[PDB]
Each structure stands twice: as structure tokens, then as C-alpha cells.
Amino acid sequence: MRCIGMSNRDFVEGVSGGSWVDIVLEHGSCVTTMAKNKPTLDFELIKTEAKQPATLRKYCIEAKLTNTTTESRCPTQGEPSLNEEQDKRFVCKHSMVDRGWGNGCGLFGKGGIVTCAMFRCKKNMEGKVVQPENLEYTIVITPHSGEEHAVGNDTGKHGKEIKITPQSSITEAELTGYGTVTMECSPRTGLDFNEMVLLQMENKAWLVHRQWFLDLPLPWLPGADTQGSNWIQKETLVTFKNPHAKKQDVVVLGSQEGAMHTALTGATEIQMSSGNLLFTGHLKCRLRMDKLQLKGMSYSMCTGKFKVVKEIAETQHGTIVIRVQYEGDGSPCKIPFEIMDLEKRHVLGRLITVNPIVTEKDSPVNIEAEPPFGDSYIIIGVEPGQLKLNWFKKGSSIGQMFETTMRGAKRMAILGDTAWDFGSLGGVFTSIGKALHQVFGAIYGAAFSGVSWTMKILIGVIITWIGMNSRSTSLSVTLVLVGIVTLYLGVMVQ
Amino acid sequence: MRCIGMSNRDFVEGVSGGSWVDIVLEHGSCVTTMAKNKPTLDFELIKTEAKQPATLRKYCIEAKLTNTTTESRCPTQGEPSLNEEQDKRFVCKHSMVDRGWGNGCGLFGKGGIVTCAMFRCKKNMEGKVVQPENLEYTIVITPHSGEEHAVGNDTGKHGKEIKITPQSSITEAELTGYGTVTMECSPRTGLDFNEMVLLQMENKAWLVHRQWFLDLPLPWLPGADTQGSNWIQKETLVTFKNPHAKKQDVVVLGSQEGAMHTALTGATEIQMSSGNLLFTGHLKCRLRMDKLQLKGMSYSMCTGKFKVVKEIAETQHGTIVIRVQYEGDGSPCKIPFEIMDLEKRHVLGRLITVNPIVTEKDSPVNIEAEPPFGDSYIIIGVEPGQLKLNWFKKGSSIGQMFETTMRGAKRMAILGDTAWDFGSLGGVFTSIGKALHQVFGAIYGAAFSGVSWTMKILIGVIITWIGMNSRSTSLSVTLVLVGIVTLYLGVMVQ
Amino acid sequence: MRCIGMSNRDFVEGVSGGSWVDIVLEHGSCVTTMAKNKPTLDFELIKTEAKQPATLRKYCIEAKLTNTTTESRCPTQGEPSLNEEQDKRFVCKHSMVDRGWGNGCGLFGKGGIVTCAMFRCKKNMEGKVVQPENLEYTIVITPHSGEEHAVGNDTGKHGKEIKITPQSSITEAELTGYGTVTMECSPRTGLDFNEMVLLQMENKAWLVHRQWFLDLPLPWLPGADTQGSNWIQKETLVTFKNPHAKKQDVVVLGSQEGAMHTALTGATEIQMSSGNLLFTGHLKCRLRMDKLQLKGMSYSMCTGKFKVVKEIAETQHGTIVIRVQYEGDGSPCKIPFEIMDLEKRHVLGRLITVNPIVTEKDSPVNIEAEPPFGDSYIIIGVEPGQLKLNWFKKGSSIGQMFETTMRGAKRMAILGDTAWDFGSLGGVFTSIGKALHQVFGAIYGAAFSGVSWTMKILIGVIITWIGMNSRSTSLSVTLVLVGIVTLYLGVMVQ
Amino acid sequence: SVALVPHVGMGLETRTETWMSSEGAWKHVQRIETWILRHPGFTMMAAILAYTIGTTHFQRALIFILLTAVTP
Amino acid sequence: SVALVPHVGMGLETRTETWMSSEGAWKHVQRIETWILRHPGFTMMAAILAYTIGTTHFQRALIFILLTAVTP
Amino acid sequence: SVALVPHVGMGLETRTETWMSSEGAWKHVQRIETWILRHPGFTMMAAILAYTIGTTHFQRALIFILLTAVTP
Ligand SMILES: *[C@@H]1O[C@H](CO)[C@@H](O)[C@H](O)[C@H]1NC(C)=O
Ligand SMILES: *[C@@H]1O[C@H](CO)[C@@H](O)[C@H](O)[C@H]1NC(C)=O
Ligand SMILES: *[C@@H]1O[C@H](CO)[C@@H](O)[C@H](O)[C@H]1NC(C)=O
Ligand SMILES: *[C@@H]1O[C@H](CO)[C@@H](O)[C@H](O)[C@H]1NC(C)=O
Ligand SMILES: *[C@@H]1O[C@H](CO)[C@@H](O)[C@H](O)[C@H]1NC(C)=O
Ligand SMILES: *[C@@H]1O[C@H](CO)[C@@H](O)[C@H](O)[C@H]1NC(C)=O
């Protein structure tokens, strides 16, 4: 029910070998899991808690230069020295100026001049590395219970909250009346934090890459530093000018906060105010619904009447949600919800909300179902009191095929080799497919390691042109499909 | 004498047709003019006063967002309208969020959402423009007189300060006893300030191009604006993030002072505290020494002895400076300075300080002279009392030829067609040469408009390869010349 | 007289164009000059007083490490920092060590480790430079007078000690009764100290090259440093050993006195205890003996006899010295000294001590003369009392010519183009010869920059083989000549 | 500087849009187009240079766009 | 952004050194070298892609360096 | 170290004897000789390598002595 308001929503219709199914819950997305004789649930990864963060490296974004000292030396007499050079807090630089009789020297030439300035960092951004073992993925599990307000309710108090932690890969989620479900997640595999840093700067946090964070041209100090006075590579925030080769002036650059923000065009924004809250990534888990039972399966069919509380509203994927209130007696019962064609030969559409029941009297219950394309009749009640609701669902079979193909392609582009395990029930076919996709993704990451989307498009066009110009067999169409994959990855990014 | 301490020093040795000579005085360099019957002068453009600055455009570098309001609209109902939409102070951006029953809507889909935030700029930078007639070039003229404190005295109190103003082109300089000299500049020809902007930010000023300044992607307001509340192109300092397509939050970027300093890798810094002080650029104009006369030319040759106060010191260009004091009687006299060879047969080295005289008794006299390469005998006194000091100047004739060729090439690469007027004595040859160089520089600025030095080197080697590959006559040599001048221009940058 | 005891002695027999002759005085050698009707002189550059030395760089040769501290960092958590890293006195180095549960951390991998040790240099060496204007070449001039112990007397009190200084190049030397001589030398051109450094270490001084001194891999500080705590390139004396990647132990290397001593093979040793005393190099200059007069020319030929005090001793160059005492009356007179053959047809040998006189009665007078090869008779007295002294001088004219050619080749190898001025009397021939040799020596120094004598012999043999293998005309003989002169410079070295 | 090296292509892109996903995607494209409009002489010079260096009717446009985008 | 499109080559260069004259000259070269040593796979991929597209032994290396320099 | 780089060849040699001019002039030849005597296998290997790489009867000995000299 919570997954209904979500735009990018997925539907899993597979259980085998013990009702185990591998799904991939995303922060911005949500997965609707359904089976034949098992209740449907809605899994949404709503939060990721990262605890005990270890500081990796602190960069300086805005600094200041005090105690500006400068001393020149006569030509052919060595370099000038300063008592502040021995202190690495003072950024120093040597250059050559014009020395002559007018500067107090005896010779005319290029004399050495040293300029030092105490480098005091005004504001610094912090880099924290978190081990993949101290993660805490918050997952909400909303069962399709047909509540009055369960549809799209993101406030909570309708589903169960599970804190997936690597310390306990095995865990059980106890629902209200649906029993318990098993969710074995792999937080160490998906979204590994061994090469990711939680860069914090002025109440704004990003999930940056470690290799990109280490080579940032800014004055930095290691995380073990508690004084904050020593900075490595101070020349990145400090310039030395030699106007007219007369004297050397040292100048501190402005606040690099704007430069950092325009340098984080690929990093994902997160929340770090009191706790490290990652709201991005994915979490792949196997779900087992053996102990999960249908709530109200023992309830009989109620021969009462139903009333339409909320009109039928079609979602973005085609599933319609109808709110119906039971009028007759015997409130615990199974709603005779069906979807047939106009002639009513048989049930042509499927039900998203498996086994819709009425919990209490005078309680509008929500029922979600995927009707077929075209005109259809939704039957809600029994023969005497029956609601025959006519619904026209737009789209076609080839249209839905194209939409689901594009959705799968986008999922493979976003998750890489993890999307091949989404909804996978096992077998040799999906196994070799995931293996080949992992090999191809490794090759792609080796090739396309840090390129932009425009460069991706350009390289894809070049590869497609070379493949079209390739006259030999078994090599042209491979290059063409590689170019098409690159074009798709370029047009589908960010 | 002031020109001696300068490394980038030029020597003009030509006067004709009324003793007029065209010289380009630069801020970082200085010019030493000399004649055969007229005293040598030293010209240094030490300051440029730009008065009456008019603010053209104020850009914002650090802003602050307040009164963050947002409004979501149901799908198929248009875009949400707010009272802050008409307010130009509030920056807004429309987006699409997931709307359904969980958000208070009736339908499920992509509903419009607007988010407005009051754009309050806390720190900003200001661009000013000055009319070319509002300039005031401060030029110091230190004639070679021989004061012990005159050699390279940047403090002044030894020469004449001329305020070249475009309103008064022809100006006069009255020296102490050397007479008067004429300078006609009209700076409206060089350093066109109609296309240059003085950009001030946190007490740091730069001289940038007008087109580059007006194309800065930052929130700006016109200079005529006083309230400062209306900013154009606010979206360059704010980001509207839509996490999970649930809500659209706007966040202000950091201070763009560091990004601006990065964007000024080719701009020249100047001083702007109370008045616009340009310490860069050039001024090519004409100097007339017809009214100038030699000071002390009517004096006889004193027979007394001389003593060396300061030893002979060679400058970077090869001219040596000797500070000697007169001992005998008859203080106003002419120093018999000469530079002969080992055999002492005929003078070879020329005197930079022409007609050295003794002004007062017990006062050291400075004498600058260009000795030949190898050993040279400097004779300061008369036959009975004579200071025959031998000096060894390193280098060769081809060495000085290559040095002056590189100096002229650097001057050309810096000044465009303006360097062809340096030391120009008139005639058709230099005129057609300057015209051809101006045409070539126009085509170069059309081709090499705003490329970097690396791109300059790349295009140069590409043009050189194309010229070496071309087999046609009169097309390969010009292409190789274009390639090599592009190589030299790319090498000599900053 | 003083020049007789010298092993390396030169004889100049040329004066023209104003009674001037160019001679090159060396420290290890001496120059015996003579004219036709002018007294012979002996010039020996005995000392070079370098004054006003300016330290340009001080290298450390032995240090000690104190306050050795170290700390390791957990893997994947950055580098470890220390409070001593901000002090440049503490040499530090970062590395990786095996970190796991046994070391106190949780992760198993390569954790960062740093170790800082205070670099306190206990003993070091000092490098100074002296300006060419601050030199003082001490030259002794001993005229051939014939005292009792004047021959080979290196203590002094026999000639005049002139201090050639560049402050006053032209200077006169007043002898006892031989008149005055003129000698301007300009120590600037000979052995220029602009590219040389006086290196002092444990009361032992050397005259090193400036480039070789600046590129010494040792901890150095600029000469302007007065505290001596901050050093540059301390990693050359301080190494960090990490056995088995467990811990980084810092240790300082041994004292570099022996390494420097073996590194100063091509350097010439001098004395620097209270003043900079250079006892090496050369000084080429012109000597004018136009004012030089013969002492005792007004004395007539005495009739008294002489007695031999010391036997005739032949020097290393072929000249003989005879000590005779006058016995007759009228001691001030010109000794009738001559060298004839058996038949005594006319004089065959030349007299070194021009115009030998007896200064005082009963005082041994030393007479030097160069007899011809073979048998000769030295006539000392008049026919009443006459000393018939036989002398057989071994050698021949071809042997003397070969020895003179070898001496000239050695002088040209030691002084380069300066040796071509030795004994020069002007003219276009010697001028073009010196110019050609100067260009050849410049090319030689550009090719043979710092090669050793073994590598010199190797390249000489290679060039000789190339010349013998090159069959082209006017190009192979030059290669063979280059190979021969390279072989000669190799065998005549150090 | 740091702003010169962006965070694109790092492989950490997920379903949720990243920082500066709206304007940062076409930032380089629009800045290159504005640099072209402000400097057409260099664009036509690079075009004719690539035309004279390609001689294949395909690599000319490739070299032209590469030389136009490589110059910041 | 603002940091992009620096004020280089605008023709206002004079005898005096400009702002960020020491580090700003080799800034692009150093950042490209760093980006290459951090991602050599793309470097070898662009080299292989240009070796089969140049066919003149000169356009290969040119397209290679252009591809390695155009990527920020 | 400093001992590795000698002061020979600088051109400052004069008539007077230099520091360690007696034993320091032939020390390289002596050390090469004793190194060849201590390591005859590498000497023979360099000899046969220069013999099979020269094939000119002159470059063989040159490359041989070069290989025995450049190896400390
Ligand atoms: C630097 O300047 C401040 C303020 O003038 C002064 O208090 C301090 O002593 C100076 N020196 C250092 C090392 O901070
Ligand atoms: C410049 O001239 C003034 C005149 O009073 C003198 O005091 C000062 O020392 C001079 N500067 C020098 C010689 O550098
Ligand atoms: C912004 O909020 C402040 C908060 O008190 C209010 O005073 C002000 O009127 C508001 N401005 C606008 C334009 O809404
Ligand atoms: C979500 O559930 C809570 C339960 O108290 C309810 O108050 C709220 O109105 C629900 N939200 C919607 C949009 O129906
Ligand atoms: C090193 O240690 C000694 C004594 O252990 C102490 O006197 C000295 O100050 C220390 N040096 C430092 C802390 O730099
Ligand atoms: C050298 O001269 C000194 C001083 O005239 C004299 O005392 C000495 O005897 C002479 N001979 C020697 C061998 O020193």
C-alpha cells in the first residue's frame, strides 16, 4: 500500500525453492513482492544509518594568511632563510627578484627572495570513512492489509521497521496478522563503503568516492590530526605573485565551498547533522515467505454489499486502487474482488492486493489490482449486491513490453550486475547471465572509469561507427551493440 | 639611473627628424633612451590612475536563502502558483513529484511542485568600467645625472613625475639642468578600456575582459541598480534537488570566491583601495628630445684624481655601473670616461651614461657604460691620475644577437602590433612592417581567440606537421612559420 | 733567483710594442722574464687572499636523531599525523605496515605508519663565495741581483710583494735599484670565482665548482640561515628501514667526512683558517718594463779576480747557477761573465742574470746562465785572473724542442685558451690562434662537461677510431687530431 | 583547481539524482556552446584544420568537435 | 560553471605576470596527468580506439591525446 | 651519496695537485679490475653478449668494456 504512491515501482511475481526471491531495495524506489498463495508486501529502503565514522582526511575550503614575512637575498649569494620556514604551518615560497644598488645590494641580477605566511584555516570540510560492518539499513515493510490510509502513507505506523545490520545477516520481521517473513540482506556487497567517503561541509554532506576524495587539490590534514595547524599541500589555496620581479606578495584564495559544490556534480547529497543518514544506494536481499501467511485466509465470503468510497485511480504503472467499504454483517470476510472483460468470460486481470479482506465494520478498505488493457469490469461484491465498475486502461501489450524493457535496462544501468539478481529465482540461465553481465560491467568500468556522459555519448558514437565500418563477421554487430549500450548509458544518467 | 635596477630593461639608440622616437613604456619594464648629442633618459610607467569608475555589473559570489516556501499541485491540474512567483527576489524552479492518496491527492502520477526561496546575497563582487579618457598614466623620468642614490631608486625624489592624460596628450617634462623633454601619447590607442572591466572582490581587484566578465555564470545585477534585491540568473548559485521525487528542496551554493580566483588564471591583479591603480599594461607613444640638452657639456675635463666608491657591477643586460668620487679641485667638470681594449688603441665600449659630470665635491658619481665582450679597460681619470680598471664581460656577439632577438620576439608576443613601434624612427619599411604585423595579429586573434597555452602548442605542432606534409611551394614555408610562431607564443605565457 | 729552485719554470724572451709582454703567473710555477737591454725578473704568484666571503649554503655531514617518535594508522583510514610533522626540524616519512587484530586495530591490511626524528646536525661543512672584486693576488718579484742565499729563497726579503687587486688594476712595483715595473692583472678574468665555491670542513678547504656544490645530495641550509635548525633534503642523511613491514625505524647515516673527501678528487685543496688563502689557479696579465732599468750599468769592468764559492749546478730546465765571490779592489762592477766554446770564436750561450754585478766586497754573488748543449766554458774574470770552468750540458736541440712543445701542450691543457697569451707580443697570428683555441675549448667544455679521465681516454680512442675509419677528405684528419688531443688531455690530468 | 575535476563517471550513480543533476548535466555543453558563440573564428579555424588533416569525410568532424571541446 | 572557462588567452596578457601564473600555467597538464594515472584503463581504451581510426600514424596519437585531454 | 658523484671533469684543474690526486685518479680502474676479478661470470656473460650484439669486430670490445665499467 505504501508503494502505490511511488512512481518508480517494481512488481515481483516469483517464488520457488522455498519461496525465496532475490530483490534489490533502493532508497528512491520500492519493490512490491507478490506470490500465488502468499500475501503481497511493499519493501522500501527508507534510510541507511552509518555509525562510528572514522575521519579520513580534512581539507581546508577557506583560509587566511597572517604574519606576512618576506626577506630577499643578494644574487650569487644563496637563498634567503626565515625562522618561520622551519614551521610547516607557515607556507613559504622562494623566487627571484631584481636586486641592485637601489635595493641595498652590491650586484645587479636575480636575487633570491623568500615569502612566508602563517596559514590559518578558517573553515574545513571533513572526510569520514565508515566500515561496511557498521551500517544500518532502515527498511519499511507495508503489508497490503487494505487500511483506510495505508495507500502511499509515508509517515509510517502502518508497516514494520527492520534495521538490517551486517552483524546479523539473518533476521525476522513479524507483521500484524500476516505472520513473519525472512529478509537476508547483503549490505557488504551492495554499496560498499570501503571506497566511499562521507564528505561533510557546512551542514551539507555528500557520498564521494575515496579515490576522488584523496586527490583533491586542497590543503589537507590526516584524520588522526587533532591540532589542525599542520596542512599538507598549502600551495593549492595560497598563491605567490612576483609583480615586475620586485617583491613577492603572498595571497590566500577565497572560500572553495562554491568550487567544491560545482566539483560535486556526481556525488549524491545525504544528511549528516546528528547521525550519518545515507538516502542513496541499494540493498540486495533474499526474501523468504514460508512463515508468511495470508491474513484472513480462513475468512469466508461475505454476501453483503459494498460502496465506493474513493473513485478508481490508475497509477503510473497501470495498477488501479479502489477504496470500498463493506455494508453487510460479518465484518471479517474475504472480498470477492475480480477483474473480467466486458462479456465476463473469466477473470482476465490480476490482483495486486492478494486476498483483500475487511478488518472491522465501517472501515473503507483499499484494494489494488492490475486490470488488462482496454475496457474491463471490476466486480467487488457478490451476485445480489454487486459493484460492476467499468474501467478503461490505456496502453497495449507491446507498449507494456517496451516500458518494462526500458525499466529493466535502466535498472541494469543503475545497479550494474546487481539488477540481474532482482527477482531472480535461481537457475543456470540467470546465473550465467549475471556472470556475463558482471564481466562486461567490470570491463566497462575499466574502460569507462571516470568519463562524463557527453564523452560517453561521443565514444559510443565512435564505437558504433567503427562497428558499422567493420567488414568482418562476428566483430561488427558486437561493436554496434556495445555502441548502443554506451549511448543508452549516456542518455540515461544522473 | 632608475632603469638600472630593472631586469627587463630596453635600450633605444636612435633619433631622427627632430629627435622624435616612439617608445613603449610598460609597468614591469623600463626604457633607456640615448642619442649621440643628447643626454640619456630613463622612462618607467610606474602607475596608472583610473578615475571616475562607473559600476557596470555586480555579481554575487556568496548568497543566503531565507523564507523557503514550497507548494505541490495535483497531477493534471497545471503548475502550482505562489505569490513569490511574481517577486523577482525569490528564486523558484518547477519540478514533478509523486502524487497519490498518501499525499492528499486523488489521482496517482507526476504532480507539479514549485519551491521559492528569497535570494539574499551576503557577499558579492563589483565590476567597474572607466572611460579611456579617465586614465592617468604616471611616468617617472630619471635622467642619468650621477647621484649616488639615483641608481635604481624606486622611492623617487630623483626624477620627474609626468601625468599622461588622454585630454592632454602633448606634455612637457622639466628636468633639473638637462632642459625640457616632450612626450605625446594619447593613450586612447592602446589598452582599450571600453572592453576591459575592473573586477573588485574582497579588496582584491583584477583587470578582466568585458565579454568574459559579462558571460560569468553568476547572479548579477546592473550597475544602475541600487536596492540590490533584483538578481538576474539566480539559478547559478542555487540547486533545486528533488530526492526520491518526493519534495523539492533548494540549497544555496557556497562562496564562489575560490572558483572566481580559479577563473582568473590569466587576469592581472591590480590595487583598488581608494583609487583604481593599474600597475599593468603598456603605453606606446612619442618622445621629443629636441628641446633637451646635455647638462654640463660646456664643462672642461678636470685633471684631478678619482677614487672608486663602489666597485664595478654588471647588470643583467651587460651594462656595468661604476660609482667613483672626484678628488681634485674644480668640482664642475667632465669625467674623462672611456672604455678601450687591452692594447688601449681605440674606444670600443659605449657609455650608457653619456657626458658624466661631477656636480658637487665629496659626492660619488655613478657612471653606466656598456663594455664589449671579453676584457675591457675602463679609464676614468686623466693621464697623471687615472683609474684603469679592467672588467671581463661574459658572452659573445652571437650571444647578444640571440638575446636581443629573443627579447624582441617576447616584446612582439606581448604587445601585438604595438611592439613594432618600439624605437621606430619612421620610414616606409617599419610602417609596412607594422601594418603587416597588425594584419597578422588580427588574423591570429581571430583564429587564436581565447585558447590556452597548451592548446596553442597543440595547434602549433599540428600546423607544423601539416606544413611539413604539404608539398606545394610557397605554402609549406609559411605554414612552418605559423607553426613555429604559435609554438613560441604558447611557450611564452604568464 | 727565487725562480731557480722552482721545478716548473718558464723563460720569456720577448718585448715589443712598448716594452710589454703577456705572462701567465701560476701558484705552483713561476715565470722568469728577460729582455735585450733590460734586467731579468722572476714573478711568482705566491698567495691569493680572498676577502669578504659570503656563505651561500651549508651542508650537513654528521647529525644525530633525537625525540624519535612514531605512530601507526588503521588501514583504509588515511595517514597517521604527528605534532612534530609541522616542524621541519623533525624529518618524517610515511609507509605501510601490516595492521590487524594483533596490533590494536580491527582491519587487516596495510595501515599507514609515520615516524619523526629531530634532525640535529652535530657537525657540518660551510660553502662560501667570494666576489671577483674582493680578490687579492700576492705576487713576488725577485730581480736577479746575486745575494748570498738569493737562489731558491722562498722565505722572502729578496723581492717585492705586490697585491694585485681589481679595485686598482694598474699598479707600479718599485724595486731596489732596478727602477719601477708596471703590472696590471685584473684577477677577475683569471680563475673567476663567480662559478666557484670555497668549501670548508674540519679546517680543510677546497675550491669546488658552484654547480657541483649546489647539487650535493646532503642536508643543506641556505647561507643566510643563522639558527641552523631548519635543513633541506634531510632524507639523504636520514633513512627509514621497515623490516618485514612491521615498524618503521628511523636512523641517521654515518659522518660524511670520508664520503666528501673521496667526492673531492677533482677539487683543489686550499687553506682556510683565518683568511681565505687560495694557492691555486692562474693570472694572465701584461708586464711593462719600459721604466725598468739595469742596476749597475754605470759600473766599469773591474780587473780583480773571482773565486768559486759553490759549484756549477744545472737546473731542471737546462740553466746553470754559479756562486762566485769577488776578491779584487773596487767591488761595485760588472762581472765579465760569458759562455764560449773550445775555440772561443764567439759567445754561444745566453746569460740569464742580465748585467751581473757585485754589490758588496766579500759577498757571494749568484750568476745564472743558459749554456748551449754540449761542452762549454764559463768565463768569469778578466785575463789576469780568470776562472776557466768547464760544463757539459746534456741533451740536444731536438730534445729541447720536444720538451718545449710538451711544456706548451701541458700549459694549453691546464690553462685552456689562457696559455696562448703566455709570452704573446701581439699580432694577428697569435690573436687568431687564441680565438680559434678559445672556440675549440668552448666546444670541448660543451661536449666534455664533467667526464672523467678514463672516460676521456675512452672517447678519445673512439674518436680516433672513427677518424681512421672515416674515408672522407678534410674531415677524418680533424677527427684524428681531436682524438689525439683528447688522449693527451686524458694522460695529462690531475 | 578542485572544480576542474568533477564527480562524474565514478560509478556511484544510483536511482536518486546526485548533486547538481539538473544544471550539471548540460553545464559543460552549454559552456562550450557559449564559448563557440563568443569565439567563432577559432571554431572555423579548427574546422578547416580538421578538414585539411582528415581527408576521410568522417574524422574531420570528429577532430573538429574534439578540438572545440578540449579547449575550456 | 564560474570556475570553468578561465580568463586565459583573452589577449590582455602583458609583461607582468597574471593572477595564478605559477600554478595556473601547468594546472590543466597536471590535472590531466593525475586523471590519466588514476584511470589508465580509459587511456588505453582511447589509444586502441584511435589506433584503428587514424590510419595515418599521426591522427592516431592526436585523437588519443585529444580524448585524454577533453575529459575533465 | 656525495662520494658517488666525483669532482673530476669540472675544468678547474690547475698545475697544483688536486685533493687525492695520487690514489683518486686510478681508483676507478682498480675497483673495476677487482670487481671483474671477484665476478668473472658476469664478465664472461657481458663479453659474450657484446660479441653477439656487436658483429663489427670493434663495437664488441667497446660494448664489453662499457658493460664492465657501468657496473660498480
Ligand atoms: C602574528 O601576528 C599577530 C597579530 O599581529 C601576533 O599576535 C603574533 O605574535 C604574530 N606572530 C605569530 C607567530 O603569530
Ligand atoms: C634614494 O634616494 C634617497 C634620497 O634621500 C636616499 O635617502 C635613499 O637611500 C636612496 N635609495 C637607495 C640608494 O636605494
Ligand atoms: C520573510 O520571513 C520573515 C520572517 O519574520 C518576514 O518578516 C518577512 O516579511 C518575510 N518576507 C517575505 C517576502 O515573505
Ligand atoms: C497516514 O496514517 C495516519 C495514521 O494516524 C493518518 O493520521 C494519516 O492521515 C495517514 N495519511 C494519509 C495521507 O492518509
Ligand atoms: C626532546 O627531548 C628532550 C628531553 O627528552 C627535551 O628537552 C626536548 O625539548 C625535546 N625536543 C622537542 C620536544 O622538540
Ligand atoms: C733566505 O733569506 C733569509 C732572509 O734574508 C736569510 O735569513 C736566509 O739565510 C736565506 N736562506 C735560506 C736558506 O733561508
Residue numbers in the entry:
A (entry chain A), B (entry chain C), C (entry chain E): 1 to 494
D (entry chain B), E (entry chain D), F (entry chain F): 92 to 163
What do the study's own words say?
When immature virions reach the low-pH environment of the trans-Golgi network (TGN), the trimeric prM3E3 spikes rearrange into the flat-lying conformation, characteristic of the mature virus.
Considering the conservation, we wanted to assess if a lipid is present in related pathogenic flaviviruses, such as ZIKV or DENV. Because the available 3.6 Å resolution map did not resolve unambiguously the presence of a lipid, we carried out our own cryo-EM reconstruction of DENV2. The reconstruction reached a resolution of 3.1 Å and again revealed a lipid in the same region, suggesting that the binding pocket is conserved in flaviviruses. We chose to carry out mutagenesis in DENV2, as this is the more amenable system and impactful pathogen. We found that no virus could be recovered after exchange of His437 (equivalent to His447 in SPOV) to either a negatively charged glutamate or a small and neutral alanine. Similarly, we observed no virus recovery upon introducing a bulky Tyr sidechain at position Gly441 (Gly451 in SPOV). Although we cannot exclude with absolute certainty that these mutations interfere with the folding of E, the results suggest that an intact lipid-binding pocket is important in the virus lifecycle, with a specific role for the adjacent histidine. Furthermore, a highly conserved and mutation-sensitive histidine (His447 in SPOV, His437 in DENV2) is located adjacent to the lipid, suggesting a pH-dependent role during the viral lifecycle.
